Design a protein around this ligand. Structure first.
Ligand SMILES: CCC1=C(C)/C(=C/C2=NC(=C\c3[nH]c(/C=C4\NC(=O)[C@H](C)[C@H]4CC)c(C)c3CCC(=O)O)/C(CCC(=O)O)=C2C)NC1=O
Ligand SMILES: CCC1=C(C)/C(=C/C2=NC(=C\c3[nH]c(/C=C4\NC(=O)[C@H](C)[C@H]4CC)c(C)c3CCC(=O)O)/C(CCC(=O)O)=C2C)NC1=O
Ligand SMILES: CCC1=C(C)/C(=C/C2=NC(=C\c3[nH]c(/C=C4\NC(=O)[C@H](C)[C@H]4CC)c(C)c3CCC(=O)O)/C(CCC(=O)O)=C2C)NC1=O
Ligand SMILES: CCC1=C(C)/C(=C/C2=NC(=C\c3[nH]c(/C=C4\NC(=O)[C@H](C)[C@H]4CC)c(C)c3CCC(=O)O)/C(CCC(=O)O)=C2C)NC1=O
Ligand SMILES: CCC1=C(C)/C(=C/C2=NC(=C\c3[nH]c(/C=C4\NC(=O)[C@H](C)[C@H]4CC)c(C)c3CCC(=O)O)/C(CCC(=O)O)=C2C)NC1=O
Ligand SMILES: CCC1=C(C)/C(=C/C2=NC(=C\c3[nH]c(/C=C4\NC(=O)[C@H](C)[C@H]4CC)c(C)c3CCC(=O)O)/C(CCC(=O)O)=C2C)NC1=O
Ligand SMILES: CCC1=C(C)/C(=C/C2=NC(=C\c3[nH]c(/C=C4\NC(=O)[C@H](C)[C@H]4CC)c(C)c3CCC(=O)O)/C(CCC(=O)O)=C2C)NC1=O
Ligand SMILES: CCC1=C(C)/C(=C/C2=NC(=C\c3[nH]c(/C=C4\NC(=O)[C@H](C)[C@H]4CC)c(C)c3CCC(=O)O)/C(CCC(=O)O)=C2C)NC1=O
Ligand SMILES: CCC1=C(C)/C(=C/C2=NC(=C\c3[nH]c(/C=C4\NC(=O)[C@H](C)[C@H]4CC)c(C)c3CCC(=O)O)/C(CCC(=O)O)=C2C)NC1=O
Ligand SMILES: CCC1=C(C)/C(=C/C2=NC(=C\c3[nH]c(/C=C4\NC(=O)[C@H](C)[C@H]4CC)c(C)c3CCC(=O)O)/C(CCC(=O)O)=C2C)NC1=O
Ligand SMILES: CCC1=C(C)/C(=C/C2=NC(=C\c3[nH]c(/C=C4\NC(=O)[C@H](C)[C@H]4CC)c(C)c3CCC(=O)O)/C(CCC(=O)O)=C2C)NC1=O
Ligand SMILES: CCC1=C(C)/C(=C\C2=NC(=C\c3[nH]c(/C=C4\NC(=O)[C@H](C)[C@H]4CC)c(C)c3CCC(=O)O)/C(CCC(=O)O)=C2C)NC1=O
Lengths: 282, 62, 172, 162, 162, 172, 172, 162
């Protein structure tokens, strides 16, 4: 299941280490890929590229690790993400761009935030860059890639869910996303709450399903529900627009429905135009 | 300024496949490798190179 | 990395002269015998695994010191490494055959390979013996005259032998 | 360079696997097309001087102001005419390198890289060379699939300059 | 290697702090158990020859096809019987090493590393060694906690082969 | 890195022979007096700060050039660095003492420490003097006759002195 | 990274002596002529592009070998690199002139550049000639008196020339 | 499932009340009848194969046309005869399930749950299964209370099919 989830093809690793480290062409590719991963697929204009770093990069004086750090600490990166977002959101973006994953638990935010508060941002990026994870998955000669999709390293299951919150498509950039300018994985991270996977748009209608548990039914039924034979299936929906009496209200929401009624409820929801995000047993 | 003044490190061939099996990328060449280390990260870089294994041949202030 | 075509055009660009008629006809000769080159590389790559495995068995039979305790092809981890490097050399030589030039063989192999073996303490002479065993195996499989259209490909076989020899000399 | 042969080799090398039938098929296609490619290269090189001088005059006619306005970035002086001839000769020599290499490798590495930087610093507007390449593409005097491939490379250069 | 003492040292080294009392307690427990571990190691090495020979016969009985099938990777030849007496001996030797080291370090460095690769290149079947290890675990003739530790290492190897 | 048990296992692996009875009894003796080793490491770690501080005072009294203006330990930042490195070498020697072998001491740290100082311009001889000061301090704190069940620990004291000596000789 | 004021304090810290009266009057002279220094750097920075471009035209006329095919400047990639490095050297030397010392210039720009060019094969002597071309251009436009409050600052111009010369000598 | 026990539990749950004496009396009646129910279930499963075989032959005799007339609904092929055996086996298994459950719950949940819809879509005739159930109701070979309860459940199925 590749196309719907969004992982079109992320199925190899681009090193630059070679006898021909320049390789006369391959270095161009490596530079592009670093820009795509570190700057979050931002469209960097030609004039503002970090020419000084690339100089040392071909010369061999700096490794790919040093190149990634140079971009990460350069003001090019800072203007896009660091200066303009909530600090916790910046921590999330750092995890996405440098270590190719999402925060697995609240302790990650605790540690990185404390670094930022005392040592400064430069030290925060340093910690990501030289963390054991970066040193192992990548190797100072391998451009960072989104390894969060693969589960081989050893990670909390929630990680998979969480990475799909940050990656909202191949085309998407974190400077320009549906929920941008505010924390995307903050309220959930404190409560260790799982997230339903929101597939990115693909030649069909899209309705980004925000999931604030402030006003939603619980994940479980927490009762007998209607009491009819069979368990209680929780159905989510986003784009409810047709029946606006005061204005529909809470256009994106979930309903806990007993099994026997699901069919009926389904058609009602389809009538309003909302595309059901998920139907999970509760 | 308690910085700059970079030092070049020269590294003995990392035997590899000895406590570094976990490393994802396979090392492609051992030894005859020069790494530009800055003064501020010199402490950490010593730790990393030695933890991986191997030795340092020479250190040249540039 | 410059394959044969790329090599000739690169030197001609360094001199700054339009490709001369002699160079054109040399390249046309290369294309005329290209099918043979492709056939040879296909046959070598189809038996890659068997080539490496048989050569390895022969090497450890002829030089038991390697697999005796305390030797460099002991511990089953170093055995895996040795097999890996033999097949790596075979892979890059097949790349070279397809290219028609030794550029790939020297770039991403043999360049700072002698030093790595020398620092690890692995005998480079034994590595050369292994390369030679693989040379005989590959040249035989690449000149096997049964199952294919007839012809003479001795020139290409000598070229293959030259690549293997270059590698063996560079490591020993 | 990005030569089809070495592109296949690199594709196999990044995945650490012996050359599969995929790469062999690619190289086979290159050898099949090489007959026409070499014919095209021979054609362009044999009448190279004629095409170079014709293109120089073409640029002079399309942009008369380039032959009159004083400045270092003009061919008003005989030295400027010489440098113009040298540049258009470079373009033709590179296209004949690209034809023989079998791909856009030569054009990419020995030209087209930082071309924007140079054309902006010394103020050589790309349009001049674009029109010159257009003349070459119209007067090359090739026929058949050889003509097709020669045109394709020339137009790659044209679009790169733009 | 992954010896208890050394892993405690590495754990302190990653934090950069002097050895705290927790680590010292751990290595003290190691030293306390070492007396029994070394007694078991002596017992295993004193009857090593009988164990190796018995395991070689056990695998011959479980897999008769392996003593008749012609080929390099079979014990149908006297050379193959020598190879069996070599490899089974290596596994028993590694078990004694693990017993002395108090951890799986030796097993990982000298056996398990790359075992998957080797059994495929030389056409060996892991089941052979698994059966041999089972014989060794049943005839080790140890008792008590020492027996528990030895059987744990043997089963580690068994599960690694599988 | 290796420890005592690991060291003997590794040598036996190099030859390829089961551990001999003599090696077994040797390591049993080592573990029989292991509580001495634990006591020594506990005392040294509990007095780390005073060990480094007293040794530093002595070092700068014996070689005042270092603290005079323009000397290598001057400006209070380099003084902090000097104290840090003294504590670092103490820490790695403590690791070695708990292990029972100087393998860890020479495998991480002192692996080009001489070279790093030589490039920095820091006098290695002065570092050696400082290591000796710390040697006396540590041997005293680990050999104090008061506060513990009486016995003999002189063997381990000579071993500790040996580790400090190895560091001092390797850094100068 | 030091400037002129930082340079005098760093020397005085090495000696361990309070700033002497000579150093005080030297820095007072530096500040009394500060507006001159600022004007010079502003003029050079404002004309950076034209300085580099004109110097480049002159260089590729006085050493046609570089531009002629097969010279370290053909290929239009290396041409871009040459222009890039000329501008880089101008940038760091302007940094130096604003600072008033050469520390910034020798710490980043020419800190081993000679070896880099020697390995690349680019002639360092020609690079020095290019730096000299830039030197005369920049000196001329900084000393241009047309449209600014008059007053002779030959001393500042000599200092600018000295910094360019230091770069040119260090690269060759 | 509409087991008597679970029915009482649900009746108390919809009112959020602790189990009153009335519910306890009902469950006691269940347990009183359960001795005969379990005896009957054991009897039916002891003769399960014989009962299914006999019922199969009964419908083959009562409707001979079903064993000759062409059509997927008919058993004019060995696979169709297997389907007949399978379905009468389903009915017998459901009867045993209902006997142990002490109620018609199992019969309603795993059968009699759109039986009309399915037989109509396939166009299979209810009469077939009705006669098969009749044979089972006569050949069950029970006596006493067990007999009356088992025949009651079989008749429930019969009237539900119509
Ligand atoms: C500290 C700032 C800094 C400097 C100084 C620097 C120098 C520098 N110049 C380079 C290239 C180059 N530099 C030149 C320069 C010249 N060619 C000539 O004919 C002239 C004589 C000369 C200019 C006056 C050329 C031709 C190359 C290209 C080398 C190549 O790719 O073949 C390279 C090779 C790798 C690359 O192009 O990125 C480096 C590292 N890099 C830096 O980050
Ligand atoms: C935009 C910069 C920024 C802010 C503001 C921020 C807030 C923030 N404050 C936190 C903790 C906290 N913040 C407070 C704050 C307070 N407790 C009180 O009793 C007071 C009323 C109040 C202070 C006056 C407390 C108690 C915690 C700890 C919560 C916990 O561990 O459960 C945490 C939890 C993670 C951690 O402790 O590392 C976050 C994310 N994070 C940020 O990056
Ligand atoms: C390879 C597949 C792919 C696509 C398609 C893609 C789209 C894409 N277009 C963007 C920007 C943009 N896209 C447009 C597009 C347009 N504005 C108009 O007026 C027109 C109607 C229209 C062009 C037809 C503009 C103006 C921006 C820049 C917005 C900004 O950065 O502020 C951005 C992010 C902001 C940025 O440029 O940094 C992305 C991610 N990204 C991808 O990876
Ligand atoms: C009492 C609290 C309350 C709020 C806040 C509320 C919001 C609200 N506004 C809606 C519609 C809408 N709201 C807008 C609003 C805007 N369109 C624009 O172009 C602007 C950018 C923006 C105003 C400046 C639009 C266009 C729709 C219709 C969307 C559609 O039919 O697709 C809908 C969708 C269903 C409907 O139309 O009834 C909701 C739920 N409803 C509520 O009951
Ligand atoms: C793809 C490019 C590439 C090349 C060329 C390459 C060669 C290469 N082979 C190596 C090791 C090795 N090579 C061997 C091979 C041998 N053992 C023997 O007994 C024989 C004499 C010989 C084979 C015939 C062994 C055993 C090692 C590992 C040494 C060790 O673990 O101690 C090493 C040292 C680090 C390592 O183990 O990887 C390199 C770099 N590696 C590469 O990634
Ligand atoms: C964890 C292993 C490890 C070791 C061993 C190590 C040594 C080490 N000590 C250093 C600094 C230093 N070390 C000293 C040490 C001394 N100065 C003296 O006067 C005495 C003779 C001596 C102490 C007795 C000094 C003065 C510096 C600062 C040098 C400078 O930048 O000026 C530096 C240079 C980078 C820096 O820290 O500023 C290294 C690499 N670094 C390490 O990461
Ligand atoms: C996908 C890559 C690829 C392969 C593998 C391939 C095989 C291939 N080999 C061919 C011919 C041939 N192959 C050989 C090969 C040999 N003659 C000998 O005596 C030797 C023992 C052996 C070489 C070592 C010869 C002589 C011909 C015919 C003449 C020629 O093409 O030069 C031909 C052309 C005529 C034909 O057989 O259909 C093809 C297509 N073609 C391909 O496109
Ligand atoms: C192989 C890749 C390659 C290219 C493309 C190349 C072009 C190139 N042409 C140049 C100059 C020049 N080229 C011309 C050419 C022309 N005059 C005209 O009237 C026409 C419109 C035009 C020809 C179509 C002129 C006038 C200059 C001098 C510009 C100046 O000094 O200001 C220069 C500046 C340095 C020099 O004088 O050589 C470069 C780099 N050099 C290269 O190595
Ligand atoms: C120190 C750890 C270590 C291990 C484990 C090891 C395994 C190992 N077993 C091998 C072969 C072999 N292993 C066997 C073993 C068996 N044959 C059978 O019929 C049985 C079922 C089974 C024994 C019970 C045989 C017959 C060979 C030779 C196969 C050949 O030469 O092709 C080889 C190939 C080299 C050789 O011929 O010895 C290795 C590397 N090598 C090591 O260095
Ligand atoms: C949590 C880690 C840990 C520590 C630290 C520890 C201490 C410890 N040290 C002991 C013995 C001892 N302690 C010493 C210590 C000394 N004797 C001397 O004469 C010297 C002045 C001095 C060297 C420091 C000696 C000689 C023994 C004798 C028993 C033995 O050698 O094993 C004993 C056994 C008898 C007793 O309780 O004293 C313990 C339990 N036990 C532990 O489990
Ligand atoms: C446990 C609940 C349950 C019931 C009740 C059940 C009955 C049942 N019997 C079926 C078919 C069938 N049943 C038969 C059986 C017979 N052939 C005869 O000659 C007789 C008259 C008759 C036996 C009385 C045949 C031939 C079919 C296939 C009819 C077709 O494919 O159209 C089918 C259609 C799907 C299939 O091919 O199996 C169902 C659903 N399946 C169930 O899961
Ligand atoms: C606050 C923003 C800012 C400014 C305005 C600046 C430049 C600057 N140039 C100045 C004048 C000047 N500029 C020159 C330049 C020259 N004239 C000549 O005939 C010589 C050839 C040459 C000396 C090399 C001279 C002589 C003065 C007057 C003396 C001086 O203050 O520098 C002055 C003093 C009077 C004035 O305000 O104009 C300033 C502040 N740097 C800055 O950061």
């Amino acid at each position: 299941a590749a196309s719907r989830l969004g992982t079109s093809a992320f199925s190899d690793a681009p090193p630059v280490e070679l006898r021909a480290n320049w390789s006369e062409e391959d270095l161009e590719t490596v530079i592009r890929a670093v820009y795509r991963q570190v700057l979050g697929n931002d469209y960097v204009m030609a004039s503002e590229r970090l020419v000084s770093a690339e100089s040392l990069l071909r010369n061999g004086k700096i490794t790919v690790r040093e190149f990634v750090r140079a971009v990460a600490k350069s003001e090019l990166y800072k203007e896009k993400f660091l200066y303009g977002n909530f600090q916790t959101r910046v921590i999330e973006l750092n995890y996405k761009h440098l270590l190719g994953r999402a925060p697995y638990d609240e302790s990650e935010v605790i540690f990185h935030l404390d670094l930022y508060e005392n040592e400064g941002f430069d030290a925060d990026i340093d910690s990501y860059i030289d963390s054991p994870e970066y040193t192992n998955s990548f190797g100072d000669w391998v451009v960072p890639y989104y390894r969060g999709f693969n589960t081989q390293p050893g990670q909390k299951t929630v990680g998979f869910n969480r990475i799909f919150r940050l990656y909202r498509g191949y085309a998407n950039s974190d400077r320009a996303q549906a929920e941008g300018s505010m924390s995307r994985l903050a309220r959930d991270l404190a409560t260790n709450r799982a997230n339903t996977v929101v597939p990115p748009s693909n030649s069909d209608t899209a309705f980004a399903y925000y999931t604030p548990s402030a006003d939603v039914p619980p994940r479980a039924c927490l009762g007998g529900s209607f009491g009819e034979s069979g368990r209680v299936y929780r159905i989510e929906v986003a784009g409810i627009r047709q029946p606006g009496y005061p204005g529909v209200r809470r256009s994106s929401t979930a309903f806990l429905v007993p099994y026997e009624q699901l069919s009926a409820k389904m058609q009602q929801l389809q009538r309003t135009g909302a595309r059901i995000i998920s139907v999970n047993p509760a | 300024p308690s910085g700059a003044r970079v030092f070049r490190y020269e590294v003995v061939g990392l035997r590899q496949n000895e406590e570094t099996d976990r490393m994802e990328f396979p090392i492609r060449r051992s030894g005859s490798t020069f790494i530009t280390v800055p003064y501020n990260r010199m402490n950490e870089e010593m730790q990393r190179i030695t933890r991986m294994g191997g030795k340092i041949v020479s250190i040249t202030p540039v | 990395m410059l394959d044969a075509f790329a090599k000739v055009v690169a030197q001609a660009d360094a001199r700054g002269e339009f490709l001369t008629n002699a160079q054109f006809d040399a390249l046309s000769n290369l294309v005329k015998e290209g099918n043979k080159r492709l056939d040879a590389v296909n046959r070598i790559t189809s038996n890659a695994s068997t080539i490496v495995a048989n050569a390895a068995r022969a090497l450890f039979a002829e030089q038991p010191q390697l697999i005796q305790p305390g030797g460099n092809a002991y511990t089953n981890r170093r055995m895996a490494a040795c097999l890996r490097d033999m097949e790596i050399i075979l892979r890059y030589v097949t790349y070279a055959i397809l290219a028609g030039d030794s550029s790939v063989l020297d770039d991403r192999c043999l360049n700072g390979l002698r030093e790595t073996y020398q620092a690890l303490g692995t005998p480079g002479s034994s590595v050369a013996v292994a390369i030679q065993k693989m040379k005989d195996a590959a040249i035989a499989i690449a000149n096997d005259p049964n199952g294919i259209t007839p012809g003479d490909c001795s020139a290409l076989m000598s070229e293959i032998a030259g690549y293997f020899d270059r590698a063996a000399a560079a490591v020993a | 360079m990005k030569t089809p042969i070495t592109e296949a080799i690199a594709a196999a090398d990044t995945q650490g696997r012996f050359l599969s039938n995929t790469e062999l098929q690619a190289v086979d296609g290159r050898f099949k097309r090489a007959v026409a490619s070499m014919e095209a290269a021979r054609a362009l090189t044999n009448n190279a001087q004629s095409l170079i001088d014709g293109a120089a005059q073409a640029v002079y006619q399309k942009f008369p102001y380039t032959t009159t306005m004083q400045g270092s970035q003009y061919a008003s002086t005989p030295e400027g005419k010489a440098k113009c001839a040298r540049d258009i000769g470079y373009y033709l020599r590179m296209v004949t390198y690209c034809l023989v290499a079998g791909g856009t490798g030569p054009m990419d590495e020995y030209l087209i890289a930082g071309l924007s930087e140079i054309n902006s610093t010394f103020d050589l507007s790309p349009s001049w060379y674009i029109e010159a390449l257009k003349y070459i593409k119209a007067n090359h005097g090739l026929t058949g699939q050889a003509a097709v491939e020669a045109n394709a490379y020339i137009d790659y250069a044209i679009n790169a300059l733009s």
